[PDB]
Amino acid sequence: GSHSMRYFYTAMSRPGRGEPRFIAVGYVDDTQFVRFDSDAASPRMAPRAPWIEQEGPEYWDGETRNMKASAQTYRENLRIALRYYNQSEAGSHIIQVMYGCDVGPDGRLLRGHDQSAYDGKDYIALNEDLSSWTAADTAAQITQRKWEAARVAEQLRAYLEGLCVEWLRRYLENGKETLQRADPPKTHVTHHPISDHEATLRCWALGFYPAEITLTWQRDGEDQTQDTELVETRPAGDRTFQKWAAVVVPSGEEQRYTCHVQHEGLPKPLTLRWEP
């Protein structure tokens, strides 16, 4: 199917406690494959998936050099942001960045991304054209002006259409046994009385990959969106994900409720019910 590669950077200042920490992680789809942490005893870009381990020392040395350079850039950006927002040197602040590419089954670019935040709010984003920027406020407009003058968007576009897609295709081939395998959810419905008058039906999905899934309850064939409790999809720790959806139902009406599961590992959506 379709696939993505994403890098996520977090830079966190901590006045009085040294220089800002810089952490980077890389993902293909929902699989982390690299990390870098400036607080490690010996900072290096390090593998986090088996299929990246075969990259040679030139790869790891180059990625480590790039992360060290990026840490320096984002430490400077934290100082610049203080000026742009008229902020004191006493507070802790955070820059976040996400960038990468999405490809289709043919491996061709579907779209690229490059967006940043300051203190958890949008700061600046590369538009889908990979040629212009959206600035969230008058501070980010200063950055936008600098990046327009230096034709930064052209450099992002070159990466996103070139090396980003090329490396993603390589990783997908090297990791094809996992990255190109969908694991369908294992599903069941549980029932727990809450009183003499009502019971909870909980529809479970376990063991699935990738994380995207839809779990819905219907009553008499109508979606129960506003009466369904839906937990956030959560990692199991073995690459797979878990989720549940619950509804409170009148006792004796349980068979009027059906749970519907959609996942890319299922050739057809599943319908299930409580099976006493």
Binding site: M45, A150, V152, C164
Partner: peptide
């Protein structure tokens, strides 16, 4: 592989 973007600051 990560983006190598030298000499670009906010």
């Amino acid at each position: 592989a990560s983006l190598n973007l030298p000499a670009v600051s906010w």
